[PDB]
């Protein structure tokens, strides 16, 4: 019931930020803040009223809330939303990151701020719709709908220091990758729908009805291959990964647009929700390839991030390595590894949000991003280097932050399933510590090798410090007490794991 409002409130809010620019340039930021606060409040109200902690696993489908409306009755297409523990967790994370993104661009008084805010809210609404839709056409619709505002934000409101041609090139590369992968996913969806139509005679796109689809061996492999191409481009999984550092480099200066659409794990959610229950045997056979791809992605992202002279590209390849960890977790078939994957995804979103916000604030202070131009910044900034030290400590898998709980439950489940990939991924954790230390010592420690890093810099504002400390508090509380997050998503993970291991 509240899910259509959960999707439409960002869209109506973005339309309001566009329309209320005539009353002032400082108005659409307040409107966007109000509507993301309303979205987050609705998500938290769904969390409180759901009773997710006391919910027990009953098998797919099992939704805490469900909405149906016919959209295209010729193909049996419905605007069909459904929320359970995992989807609610991702919706809450999306709302929190949207509030952080709206706050992160609070000092932009540009003449066209209203369209920027509409663009951001439409990205957030598309991400929420991806997390909520259980109709194949609607899920694909939101999946490709959240990319046009992404493209326009990167291309027009991107990094002003870089040339326009590089911004358009990076945005076009990102759009081409994501939309071609979405098209392949659509072809897999259509072939699955047609297989179900020949087997049954009923036109439908519903996830619940397409679950019991009798398919031969080889067709199911192709369908899961298309789904995995989409969910591996947007994860990212190597070699389908260059769009992520190219778009992070040319992202807008404040870093809000990084948090809005690039930083939310829609692809791994789709792997958990759509790839494994619909195609269990084919995913079971593709598990070694995906797990070795995750190992190669971890080490490729580590060696990439160590060799990066750009901070934003370093955080992008950190995201690549941690998403490789999640990809290893997803194809294990273990409840403990799945719960660790959920915790790791939430904690990695929080840590990368803190890292990108601190990098944006640092670029506001110093107007450069090259590691050969900073050094010894601890003595010049009041708050930024210690908070960045905390967040780089979080991204190396340090206990006390939720990332450690994430990768360690992932590796416990993986060692229960596959030990060699577990031990190689732990060496990947060593590599993660290596590049985090390299970034810390190239950025804030040492002696200054530039003139702009030889002067005293102004301290951070109250709102940026407040939101970064909020991220710090959330990461620490997730590291020390991850139990409410674990009990929130216990039923959905249980249903997915039981459906995966009971149909092989």
């Amino acid at each position: 019931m509240l899910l259509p409002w959960l999707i439409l409130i960002p869209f109506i809010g973005g339309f309001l930020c566009w329309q209320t620019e005539r009353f002032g340039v400082k108005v659409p930021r307040w409107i966007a803040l109000i509507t993301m606060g309303l979205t987050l409040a609705l998500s938290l109200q769904l969390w409180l009223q759901g009773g997710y902690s006391l919910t027990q696993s009953a098998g797919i489908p099992q939704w805490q809330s469900e909405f149906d409306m016919p959209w295209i009755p010729r193909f049996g297409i419905s605007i069909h939303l459904a929320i359970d523990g995992l989807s609610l967790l991702m919706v809450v994370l999306t709302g929190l990151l949207g509030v952080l993104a709206v706050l992160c661009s609070w000092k932009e008084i540009e003449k066209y701020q209203g369209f920027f805010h509409l663009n951001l809210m439409w990205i957030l609404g598309g991400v929420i719709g991806v997390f909520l839709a259980i109709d194949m056409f609607l899920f694909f619709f939101f999946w490709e709908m959240m990319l046009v505002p992404m493209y326009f934000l990167i291309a027009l409101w991107g990094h002003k220091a870089s040339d326009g041609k590089t911004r358009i090139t990076a945005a076009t590369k990102f759009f081409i990758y994501t939309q071609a992968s979405g098209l392949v996913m659509l072809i897999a969806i259509l072939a699955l729908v047609f297989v179900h139509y020949n087997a049954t005679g009923v036109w439908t796109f519903n996830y619940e009805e397409l679950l019991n689809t009798p398919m031969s061996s080889g067709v199911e492999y192709l369908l899961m291959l298309g789904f995995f191409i989409a969910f591996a481009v947007k994860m990212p999984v190597v070699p389908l990964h260059g769009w992520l550092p190219d778009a992070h480099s040319q992202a807008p200066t404040a870093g809000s647009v990084d948090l809005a659409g690039i930083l939310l794990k829609t692809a791994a959610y789709g792997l958990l929700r759509f790839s494994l229950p619909l195609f269990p045997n084919a995913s079971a056979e593709f598990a070694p390839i995906a797990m070795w791809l995750g190992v190669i992605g971890i080490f490729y992202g580590a060696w990439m991030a160590f060799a990066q002279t750009d901070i934003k590209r370093l955080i992008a390849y950190t995201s690549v390595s941690h998403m490789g960890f999640v990809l290893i977790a997803i194809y294990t078939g273990s409840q403990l590894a799945y719960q660790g994957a959920v915790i790791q995804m939430i904690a990695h979103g929080l840590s990368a949000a803190g890292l990108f916000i601190l990098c944006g604030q640092l670029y506001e202070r110093i107007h450069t991003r090259d590691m050969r131009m900073m050094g010894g910044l601890w003595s010049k900034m009041k708050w930024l280097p210690a908070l960045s030290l905390f967040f780089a400590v979080a991204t190396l898998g340090m206990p006390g932050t939720g990332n450690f709980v994430g990768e360690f439950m992932i590796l416990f489940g993986s060692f229960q399933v596959v030990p060699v990939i577990t031990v190689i991924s732990t060496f990947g954790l060593v590599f993660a510590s290596v590049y985090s230390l390299a970034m810390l010592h190239r950025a804030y420690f040492g002696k200054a090798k530039s003139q702009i890093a030889s002067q005293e810099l102004p301290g951070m504002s109250l709102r940026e410090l407040f939101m970064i400390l909020l991220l710090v508090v959330l990461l620490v509380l997730l590291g020390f007490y991850p139990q409410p997050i674990l009990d929130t998503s216990h039923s959905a993970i249980g249903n997915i794991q039981q459906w995966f291991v009971n149909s092989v």
Partner: protein
């Protein structure tokens, strides 16, 4: 006894307050907050010990909450307290309090006062978590917090990039050790389904009745994590380089907190190593080799802090040898004594450095006994305790217990290694003492810790016993004649090492300069100065290929591989655009070509 969580709450409160102070408080207030948090932890430790001894040595358990609960994976936030945990906690709190008072005197006039005190308070809290945890995951939390605080304290003078490189090497080697510890954690949870120590020692022999290979692997990776944190073979190369922090940082790392974590790992999980005797023998062999190599490296070292580090290395090697001969109480008693005199030696070395107002090699100074009599006395008694001087020093009693347990269990090669290591220990210790304090002169907040460690490095430290009865198994008792001749042999070895040091370095270095210039002397001194080429081997085997792969991959080859179809599409479009030349005759010719192609295809496929 119920205030066991206060020993972590108070240092955590101190660390949080001193971090968020950001130097805005005065140095008096920051020092008061830091050393008062550590002193409150020490006082709560004293009350806990009083209640523990008044309760008849009963193990106490205080759960706080549940960390993780995913199906059968149940990890709890529980603290435990037995005799071993009480000994560890008392050592950490007392030695940290003395070091904190010394640092409150020592860091005066320095930047990052609150940062230093916050990092040391977090170090104390993480070590208390390490020594109080009842499950391996909470102990891993304390383990990694201890490693993080070691990284943050070694590179305290961040302006020099060499300190940052030292902190890098320290954290990377300790992280490899923590990955081996994680390997052991994964194996133990996969086998027994639990991470509690008592549950391991309860349902380990029932599960491993048929096969013992996985338990052997688990104990091997436990040993790997232990030697990762205790700076032993083969993960020892970080310590001498990671000297880069201040003197109280080195004292806290070498004496109280950091390198005793591996010994606490081996002694805490003693049952699992007891059912795998080959791994325990490997622990003993690793300790023996580490102490021998540490002695040979400390014999030629020219820096006082570096030879103190290799002395710490040889002491932890003796401790690992004691663990490998099933002498657990001797190992923990040696932890107590070695923490006391190594803290004393490092504080005296810091006083020497501040008196010399520069970090120089030991050959630069000489005849410093007249300038600083108290520091000379501190260094003398610390060297006497480190060299196991009989009947006056606690180090003699602790080492005597170590070799008594070693000889009483049928280990003779380890006995020979221990005797040679004691001889070399006395040799390098009083070599450094006679070089730095004898020759020709060229150039209340701290006296109290020096006096306390002055007292505790003597036989007063040997008067203190740890309450390890009922926690660790009892050692096999040696014969009275064998124990007497072992004490006589150890004392004789100590005094002949003292006399050889007085022959060789107290007088004019003639035979030292006779054996120095020879080519065997050059090769042996070059080999022993560079830690037997272990750091060079790890640079050529793990660091250089890593840098080479990073330089080879910095251009993102997979991105170019996936961008190849874009180049193919551009080239194909450019080639196809040549047909649009704008000539009408070519258009008619192409239309006729298409007609021919269509008709030929229809005729062929008919």
């Amino acid at each position: 006894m119920n205030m066991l969580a206060l020993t972590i709450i108070l240092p955590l409160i101190g660390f949080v307050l001193l971090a968020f102070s950001r130097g805005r408080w005065s140095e008096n207030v920051s020092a008061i907050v830091g050393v008062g948090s550590v002193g409150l932890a020490a006082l709560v430790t004293a009350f806990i010990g009083v209640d523990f001894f008044a309760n008849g040595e009963q193990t106490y358990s205080q759960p706080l909450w549940t960390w993780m609960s995913v199906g059968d994976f149940n990890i709890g936030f529980n603290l435990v307290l037995d005799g071993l945990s009480l000994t560890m906690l008392s050592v950490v709190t007392g030695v940290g309090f003395l070091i904190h008072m010394y640092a409150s005197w020592y860091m005066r006039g320095e930047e990052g006062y609150s940062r230093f005190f916050a990092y040391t308070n977090l170090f104390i809290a993480s070590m208390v978590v390490l020594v109080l945890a009842d499950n391996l995951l909470l102990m891993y939390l304390g383990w990694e917090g201890v490693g993080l605080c070691s990284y943050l304290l070694i590179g305290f003078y961040y302006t020099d990039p060499k300190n940052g490189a030292a902190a890098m090497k320290a954290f990377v080697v300790t992280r490899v050790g923590d990955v081996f510890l994680a390997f052991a954690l994964f194996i133990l949870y996969n086998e027994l389904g639990t991470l509690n120590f008592r549950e391991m020692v309860e349902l380990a022999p029932a599960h491993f009745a048929d096969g013992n290979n996985m338990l052997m692997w688990a104990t091997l990776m436990l040993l790997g994590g232990a030697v990762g944190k205790s700076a032993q073979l083969p993960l020892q190369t970080w310590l001498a380089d990671a000297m880069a922090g201040p003197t109280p940082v080195s004292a806290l790392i070498h004496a109280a907190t950091m390198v005793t974590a591996g010994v606490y790992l081996i002694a805490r999980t003693h049952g699992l190593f007891l059912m795998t005797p080959e791994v325990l023998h490997l622990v003993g062999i690793v300790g023996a080799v580490t102490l021998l190599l540490a002695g040979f490296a400390a014999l030629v070292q020219t820096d006082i802090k570096r030879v103190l580090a290799y002395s710490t290395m040889s002491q932890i090697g003796y401790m690992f040898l004691a663990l490998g001969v099933q002498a657990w109480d001797a190992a923990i008693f040696h932890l107590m004594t070695h923490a006391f005199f190594k803290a004393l030696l490092f504080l005296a070395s810091g006083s020497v450095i501040l008196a010399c107002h520069h970090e120089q090699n030991i050959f630069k100074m000489g005849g410093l006994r007249k300038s600083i009599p108290l520091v000379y006395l501190c260094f003398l008694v610390g060297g006497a305790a480190l060299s196991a001087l009989p009947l006056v020093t606690a180090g003699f009693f602790s080492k005597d217990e170590i070799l008594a347990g070693a000889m009483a269990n049928g280990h003779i090669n380890l006995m020979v290694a221990g005797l040679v290591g004691a001889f070399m220990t006395s040799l390098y210790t009083f070599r450094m003492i006679f070089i730095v304090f004898h020759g020709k002169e060229q150039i209340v907040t701290h006296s109290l810790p020096l006096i306390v460690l002055l007292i505790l490095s003597t036989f007063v430290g040997a008067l203190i016993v740890p309450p390890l009865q009922g926690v660790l198994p009892q050692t096999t008792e040696l014969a009275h004649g064998s124990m007497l001749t072992l004490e006589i042999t150890s004392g004789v070895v100590a005094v002949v090492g003292i006399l050889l040091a007085a022959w060789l370095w107290l007088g004019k270095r003639t035979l030292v300069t006779s054996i120095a210039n020879s080519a065997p002397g050059r090769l042996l001194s070059t080999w022993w100065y560079n830690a037997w080429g272990f750091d060079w081997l790890y640079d050529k085997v793990f660091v250089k290929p890593f840098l080479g792969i990073a330089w080879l991959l910095k251009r993102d080859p997979l991105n170019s591989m996936m961008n190849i179809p874009a180049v193919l599409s551009r080239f194909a479009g450019k080639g196809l655009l040549l047909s649009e030349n704008g000539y009408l005759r070519w258009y008619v010719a192409s239309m006729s070509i298409g007609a021919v192609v269509v008709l030929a295809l229809l005729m062929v496929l008919r």
